[PDB]
């Protein structure tokens, strides 16, 4: 039966699909992490500029 | 018609690295084709010829293989008189052949 | 020989695994690039507006 050849094709494709899907999941997670770390660091910049502004006042 | 012989289980599709090709061969030459398709190109898995049907002259089979093989495979099939007839379970085309056979007979009446 | 074709394909199919790993590594390289690009663009655009406000 042709399953002896066909399952070797399907196994390589399933392995391939998993490796690509994991990288796409990582891509989405990294983009979310960039927004969150930017939101933390931008407040640190604001707080420093606020301290300098109060000193000038 | 492909609509009389095409069935889903004979196909490997909907994939990044995988293809199904389709080839017609004479009934005498089929006895060579059963092995010889594996010699046409690299990236072909063994035992992947799958006959859809046979007749008074000939066979049509699917060949299931990795995507890199396909253009060398099809060209070298033609150079050896193995006739490429690609139809990748085309549901819209088999449905069109069935519905239009019924319709044009009915409309002619 | 069916066994020799099986020995050949068992080697040759490793190129599909390599191309899939390289495709995943390209998506990961894009994830690292777009992380740095998006973070930098967002932070510096807002930081400029914050410096202008103050």
3-state SS string for chain A: CCHHHHHHHHHHHHHHHHHHHHHHHHHHHHHHHHHHHHHHHHHHHHHHHHHHHHHHC
A22: closest CA of chain B, how far (Å): 16
Dist CA B68 CA C30 (whole Å): 25
B87: closest CA of chain C, how far (Å): 24
List the one residue out of B21, B27, B3, B24 whose CA is nearest residue B80. B24
Tokens, residue C46: 């807002």
Which value in Å is the resolution of this experimental model? Answer: 3.7
Provide the 10 A C-beta neighbour count for residue B105: 9
Q: Is B43 on the interface with C (CB under 8 A)?
A: yes
Dist CA B80 CA A33 (whole Å): 57
Of the candidates A4, A13, A20, which has its C-beta nearest B18's C-beta?
Answer: A13
Tokens, residue B76: 């070298």
Q: Which domain holds residue B56?
A: 1-88
Contacts A–B by Cβ distance under 8 A: 36
Which technique was the structure solved with, according to the deposited record? cryo-EM
B35: closest CA of chain C, how far (Å): 9
List the CATH number of the domain containing B83.
3.30.70.100
Of the candidates A15, A26, A30, which has its C-beta nearest C20's C-beta?
Answer: A15
Per the CB < 8 A criterion, the answer to whether B60 and B91 are in contact is no
């Amino acid at each position: 039966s042709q399953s002896q050849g066909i399952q070797q094709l399907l196994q390589a494709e399933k392995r391939a699909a998993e490796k690509v899907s994991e990288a796409r999941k990582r891509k989405n997670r990294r983009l979310k992490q960039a927004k969150e770390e930017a939101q933390a660091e931008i407040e640190q910049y604001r707080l420093q500029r606020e301290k300098e502004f109060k000193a000038k006042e | 018609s492909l609509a009389e012989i095409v069935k889903k289980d004979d196909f490997v599709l909907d994939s990044e690295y995988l293809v199904t090709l389709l080839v017609v061969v004479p009934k005498l030459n089929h006895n060579d084709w059963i092995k010889q398709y594996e010699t046409l190109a690299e990236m072909v898995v063994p035992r992947s010829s799958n006959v859809l049907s046979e007749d008074q002259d000939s066979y049509l089979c699917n060949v299931t293989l990795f995507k890199k093989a396909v253009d060398d495979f099809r060209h070298k099939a033609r150079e050896n008189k193995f006739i490429v007839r690609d139809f990748q379970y085309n549901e819209e085309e088999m449905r069109a052949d069935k519905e239009e056979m019924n319709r044009l007979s009915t409309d002619k009446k | 020989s069916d066994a020799d074709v099986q020995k050949q394909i068992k080697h040759m199919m490793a190129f599909i695994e390599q191309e899939a790993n390289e495709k995943a590594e390209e998506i990961d390289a894009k994830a690292e690039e777009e992380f740095n690009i998006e973070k930098g663009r967002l932070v510096q655009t807002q930081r400029l507006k914050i410096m202008e406000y103050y």
